[PDB]
Amino acid sequence: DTIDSILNQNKNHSALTSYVSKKDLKNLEKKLEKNQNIGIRIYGDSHMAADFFPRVIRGYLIRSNSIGFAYPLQPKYQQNLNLVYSYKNFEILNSRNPANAGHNFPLGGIIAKAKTKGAKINLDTTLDKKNFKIGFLFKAKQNTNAFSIKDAKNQSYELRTTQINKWSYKELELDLPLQISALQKDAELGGYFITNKDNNVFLDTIAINGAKSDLWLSWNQTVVKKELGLLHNDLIILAYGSNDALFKGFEKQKFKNNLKKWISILKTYNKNAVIMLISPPTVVQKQGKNYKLAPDFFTIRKALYEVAKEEKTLIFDMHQFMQDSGGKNKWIEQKLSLNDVHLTIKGYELMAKKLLEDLKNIIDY
């Protein structure tokens, strides 16, 4: 009830601002009550990649019955709590990594590359339902069989490209747990789309530790568009800003332009989707021994409000709630925060429940 007490002290001061028309908000509210198809996605960085914040939203905003998009393998210290992974002899390529720069990246920028013929990936879900329509994004050096798939029911299948060095897609109706085996070395996996045959309620995530707002520029735009069209999202959340303030390359107009191009692409490829931006928590950086505010943090936060009005989106301000309830220093004392930009699990759940509280004042769910 530590989280509950702080929410009650700040019940009157919302951190959520709306520039969305009453038409889009109401239409989203109707889907939430209908409980038929509700697709939600969270793009972001480390404040989302370990599924702490999205899990609270997934459990309380919707009655989840599906998964959606998921990485071929989770990068280290990242997770989607709907899924369980294990693998041998697979290399994880990350678009955020400079050492992996120059590859043909799909949506999310994560690639599982078979180090050898016979490399295996085991995939299961934490749900008790195991029958799923699963789409595989794969890529191979030769037009022979790229991967082998065995399901829980012993049905064996093959992933096979018709064009080499091109991201391909293929859907199968399988039962988890399933094992993937590489039939070629250097064969690649780009992600899965795990959905029910109809009436899908889910919250998937596309988050990368240390990702800037413009990480999507690293990806294959043709394949990104094909993957955006494979799974419609009714509510799309963009939680960026921290790493634009911590790493080089920030310029306010370039920050806004790239983000506005991304918002327009997402709204075009997800008709009637409600867009929500999430502004980072109080971003600090090391002074040597000490910690100090990032100078670009307050410019990024202001730019996110500007983009929210220009693109008519919601904006949840995590720094606003952090400041309304004592500030980052008070959050560190109570282990809601760490000394750097990161928060604890308790802080991420307090943030998520605060958004759920402020969401109530504009949307019935």
SSE blueprint:
Blueprint: H1 2-9, E1 16-18, H2 22-34, E2 38-44, H3 46-49, H4 52-60, E3 68-70, E4 83-88, E5 90-94, E6 110-114, E7 120-125, E8 131-139, E9 145-150, E10 156-160, E11 168-175, E12 178-182, E13 188-195, E14 201-207, H5 221-228, E15 235-239, H6 242-246, H7 252-269, E16 274-279, E17 284-288, E18 290-293, H8 297-310, E19 314-317, H9 318-324, H10 328-333, H11 345-360
Parallel strand pairs: 2-14, 2-15, 15-16, 16-19
Antiparallel strand pairs: 1-19, 3-13, 4-7, 5-6, 6-13, 7-12, 8-11, 8-13, 9-10, 9-12, 17-18
InterPro entries: Ape1_N (IPR055041), Ester_Hydrolysis_Enzymes (IPR051532), SGNH_hydro (IPR013830), SGNH_hydro_sf (IPR036514)
Keywords: Signal
Domain SGNH hydrolase-type esterase: 201-350
